Amino acid sequence: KSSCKRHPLYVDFSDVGWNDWIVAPPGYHAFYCHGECPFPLADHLNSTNHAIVQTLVNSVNSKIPKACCVPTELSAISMLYLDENEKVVLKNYQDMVVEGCGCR
């Protein structure tokens, strides 16, 4: 089936129940990773030797599962929140958005 790819995902903070503390943005394009990790591995330039060993082990013994499609390149986003003084505060939140997917 479909190999390891990045897929769209818009996180609306109001649907998730975070509109009460996040002033801005109303949501964000987080994305998600999903898909089969057969030989050769997706993001093979950065993929771990262990994933290479495990997908080889899987090819000999199906009881051992293949490597898994997860975010391998992430990016941060700036958000606004209110503090005790009811004042808006900017903070950068690390590894919020997926830039690339790979097998791990």
Partner: protein, 70 residues
């Protein structure tokens, strides 16, 4: 300073009981859930803009629904 990791680690420690159910883990897990909920509510003022905290509150009340506790 936000002390949310302290609450989670304590909860992960207390929730090391499988499974049974007698039944069971309902009176055990909901005690662990309330302890966690209480700990997060105590560090509430310090975690004003902490993502891991705001995820813990929605995570706790989600477990409180299934199975029913409090």
């Amino acid at each position: 300073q936000c002390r949310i990791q302290k609450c989670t680690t304590d909860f992960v420690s207390l929730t090391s009981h499988l499974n049974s159910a007698v039944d069971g883990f309902d009176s055990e897990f909901c005690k662990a859930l309330r302890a966690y909920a209480g700990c997060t509510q105590r560090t509430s003022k310090a975690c004003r803009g902490n993502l891991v905290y705001h995820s813990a509150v929605l995570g706790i009340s989600d477990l409180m629904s299934q199975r029913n506790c409090s």
